[PDB]
């Protein structure tokens, strides 16, 4: 319990425990030796003043030098370490779990914090496990996300929130689900648009589309494959369009848990949907399950017109082509349906801005 250079009798907890040589040096002589070694000697002369015993020594010594040295003496130690040993700045690591900063100049990918003594990846900063060895980092975090019970317990609700609502005017991203309400209001730029097709909701007398009969009312214009229209389809007919194109869809979970944002006095509070989750709807609302089916339809660019009857084709022609169709002489309902379906799919494309 004596200082190995001055002999001063101090408790062990009141001296500098030099990690490299395990001496016991009082704070005064610790300051004295390393300050003169930097201001008048070379950094290679920074051995222990008691005994006299590489870059992992400087990493452990940097911690003790930060505590006892002066701010300007500590800056001179970085300068000579940079200008004399490394030819560059030292790589300073922050431990994400204990917030301790330390120098790490080793070639290994896993670094151990000198404070909390936990191992983490130098690029990930996630806690290290043997499953990360030999695996890419993106593969590792996606492995922990695929094996988290609380993550998987939410089910398809996490899929609807990943499909973010991007405001087409200000490009702000909202990690939300569309649900049943299609009229979206952006708080950043006040733009009003549909969350399914990203088309504009026009105010009174602001719609420029020709042959529109609701110009004096707030409304938007949606393609035939928008959630605005396909929400009116039954869940059965929606998934038959998926089945007709060999697209899988959930009916069982792998109150509705989809997170919504309600208005509260102190901003916005996250609240689950909590609606009735019928059987065969993957444990979600009817509105959110239909949103889940429509996202699969839009991702594969499935055309709902392939299931249109004759009346539905006449409606789509008057809406998107602004021409009332009429059967030709010699046509039967199949020929009249085939003609309208062909001209509709040739002249009117699907959603040119629907998230796919």
């Amino acid at each position: 319990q004596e200082c190995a250079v001055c002999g001063w009798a101090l408790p062990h907890n009141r001296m500098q425990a030099l990690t490299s040589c395990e001496c016991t040096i009082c704070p005064d002589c610790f300051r004295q030796h390393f300050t003169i070694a930097l201001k008048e000697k070379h950094i290679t002369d920074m051995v222990c003043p008691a005994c006299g015993r590489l870059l992992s020594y400087f990493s452990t010594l940097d911690i003790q030098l930060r505590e006892s040295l002066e701010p300007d003496a500590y800056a001179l130690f970085h300068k000579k370490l940079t200008e004399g040993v490394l030819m560059r700045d030292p790589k300073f690591l922050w431990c994400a779990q204990c917030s301790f900063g330390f120098i790490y100049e080793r070639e290994q990918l896993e670094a151990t914090c000198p404070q909390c003594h936990q191992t983490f990846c130098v690029r990930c900063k996630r806690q290290w496990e043997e499953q990360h060895r030999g695996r890419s980092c993106e593969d590792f975090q996606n492995w922990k996300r695929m094996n988290d019970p609380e993550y998987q317990a939410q089910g398809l609700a996490m899929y609807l929130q990943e499909n973010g609502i991007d405001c087409p005017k200000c490009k702000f991203s909202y990690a939300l689900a569309r649900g049943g309400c299609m009229h979206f209001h952006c708080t950043q730029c006040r733009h009003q648009f549909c969350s399914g097709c990203y088309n504009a909701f026009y105010a009174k007398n602001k719609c420029p589309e020709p042959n529109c009969r609701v110009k004096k009312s707030l409304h938007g214009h949606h393609p035939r494959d928008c959630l605005f229209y396909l929400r009116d389809w039954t869940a059965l007919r929606l998934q038959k369009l998926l089945q007709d194109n060999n697209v899988m869809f959930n009916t069982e979970p792998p109150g509705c848990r989809v997170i919504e944002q309600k208005e509260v006095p102190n901003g916005l509070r996250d609240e689950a949907c909590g609606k009735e989750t019928p059987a065969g709807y993957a444990g979600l609302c009817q509105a959110h399950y239909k949103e889940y089916l429509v996202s699969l339809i839009n991702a594969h660019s499935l055309d709902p017109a392939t299931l249109y009857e004759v009346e539905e084709l006449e409606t789509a022609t008057e809406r998107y082509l602004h021409v009332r169709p009429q059967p030709l002489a010699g046509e039967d309902p199949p020929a009249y349906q085939a003609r309208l379906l062909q001209k509709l799919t040739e002249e009117v494309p699907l959603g040119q801005s629907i998230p796919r």
Partner: nanobody
Amino acid sequence: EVQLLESGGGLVQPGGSLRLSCAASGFTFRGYSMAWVRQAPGKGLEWVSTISPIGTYTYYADSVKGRFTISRDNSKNTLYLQMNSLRAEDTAVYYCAKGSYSRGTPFDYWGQGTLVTVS
């Protein structure tokens, strides 16, 4: 996205007790460690304490260890800081901090802060 809101600051007599809170949203609270930091008047920012993502490990600065107690409620995405036997040197703006896994910073988000004054 990320939002950290502090609460509980105010004027406290010396030797008094105070409890700060931090309401977190916009990220998975249970997946990151949280920390409290403070800045005394006219001084540099000083780290107070840090709690592990699920709460098994707690770290403290030497001047507040045993006097302050950090805790979190992942069920409610809330960080807490119980401060006992407050001294005049505890007067500072106390900031809630969210830990980060991005290179070059131990924290990527800080809150608005709450002012704590010790008479």
